[PDB]
Amino acid sequence: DSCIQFTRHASDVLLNLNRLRSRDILTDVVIVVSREQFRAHKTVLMACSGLFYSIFTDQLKCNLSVINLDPEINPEGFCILLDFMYTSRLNLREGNIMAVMATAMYLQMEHVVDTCRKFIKASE
Amino acid sequence: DSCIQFTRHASDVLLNLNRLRSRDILTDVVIVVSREQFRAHKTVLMACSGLFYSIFTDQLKCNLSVINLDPEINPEGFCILLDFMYTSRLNLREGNIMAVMATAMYLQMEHVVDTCRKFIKASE
């Protein structure tokens, strides 16, 4: 087509979605991790994670307001990944990289799994 | 902080939100324009428009599944703007610029209003 494009549009949308998350506006699901609860928007989770995409396209699970993650999932790893979903920023540190990569593999967040593999390979 | 950032994350999120819109997945509102109906996600509309932000933060209107726009709003202008919200791409043409700018002023989409004003000024 002959469209024009606003370079900062996608980033401004994500920033606003994160402001809604901060203020708990229109959040429609609770993610339960080892008795730690995280409120979020189903559409943002689906847009970021192959696991959430599969969960919320399921005709029965699409209607659930609570999702319980596998007990092996670390709440801090999940929190770091949820923040990444809403900001594009990943707080990757020596002390959390193993939990973050394990959580990203479970959530099916391929780009995160890729940078974790590379950061681990550089330290060996 | 010491975060790393994935450059394409915001764009990939918006692309996935638009794929959900295309497939009518988790859309939670109908926008009615001069008897033309558009299905969308409330959070994306709020993230893009000062008008939708104000509507869906209202304690009564936040729960509505149908929103009727002012009858002066042109359905094509709305359609072009809805596409822009979900893609960052604006189909601005000589034949639609007046309807698009009027719709963007009503929806409170300041960056769109800005490029319409500039494109109009260049033709005078």
Binding site: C3, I4, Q5, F6, T7 | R89, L90, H111, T115
Partner: peptide, 4 residues
């Protein structure tokens, strides 16, 4: 704004 840009030409994509």
């Amino acid at each position: 704004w840009v030409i994509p």
